[PDB]
């Protein structure tokens, strides 16, 4: 649930000279298995040649808009230096709801409606 750890796992694997695809797929599994309800990963740079591009991946639920983004969403950014230039890495994770308030917010999102069962 810490994006600053996972981004450094990614940065390591670039220096270990391992494909971005395999590295990112592993990161997403770790984030989801640890209980994150979704995440976003983007890699950008001179990644596969002289023409630069960025590759972005999305899994599960991610919030972008309003006050619910400030309480459920966590972000980190890093960069790795290689012989050809700098490659930039962005990671974002959406925290789980947690009734004891350790892993994420106590109260679920303001727009969710739940109707109680009948006796």
């Amino acid at each position: 649930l810490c994006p600053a750890i996972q981004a450094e796992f990614i940065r390591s694997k670039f220096e270990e000279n391992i494909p971005y695809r395999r590295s990112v797929v592993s990161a997403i599994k770790n984030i989801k298995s640890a209980g994150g309800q979704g995440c976003v990963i983007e890699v950008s740079g001179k990644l596969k040649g002289q023409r630069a591009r960025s590759v972005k991946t999305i899994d599960g639920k991610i919030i972008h808009a309003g006050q619910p983004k400030e309480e459920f969403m966590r972000y980190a950014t890093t960069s790795v230096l290689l012989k050809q230039g700098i490659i930039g890495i962005k990671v974002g994770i959406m925290l789980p709801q947690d009734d004891e308030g350790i892993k994420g917010p106590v109260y679920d999102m303001v727009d969710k409606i739940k109707v109680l069962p009948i006796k």
């Binding site: 727009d111 409606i113 739940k114 109707v115 009948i118």
Partner: protein
């Protein structure tokens, strides 16, 4: 534009089917009931839900809303049906009818006070 939005109409529709007998023609009764039963986290939403529910309750009690089954009004419609029609085709035993039908009556030897249509 004053349209209610999807969660507000959905919660409105579910509550009237789940608790129908508890509701009345009064906004303040209906606001008390949704304050009592529901999880809704802002007065801004429950003012809109109770608004739509008291907008339905008129149309529903006025001989029903199609797409909204209420057991209390299935019973009311059974009472209206149990108020049985006393009209009758049953006494219309004397009849006149066309020749082709009179020959079908002949070819199957059907007894009764039939006549050729005088027309």
């Amino acid at each position: 534009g004053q349209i209610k939005g999807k969660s507000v109409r959905t919660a409105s529709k579910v509550i009237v089917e789940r608790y129908f007998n508890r509701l009345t023609n009064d906004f303040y009764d209906n606001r008390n009931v949704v304050i009592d039963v529901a999880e809704i986290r802002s007065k801004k939403l429950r003012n809109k839900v109770s608004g739509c529910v008291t907008k339905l309750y008129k149309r529903v009690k006025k001989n029903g809303v199609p797409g909204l089954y209420i057991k209390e009004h299935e019973e009311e419609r059974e009472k209206k049906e149990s108020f049985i029609p006393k009209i009758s085709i049953l006494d219309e035993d004397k009849v006149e009818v066309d020749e082709v039908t009179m020959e079908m009556i002949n070819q199957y030897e059907i007894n009764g006070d039939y006549v050729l249509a005088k027309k």
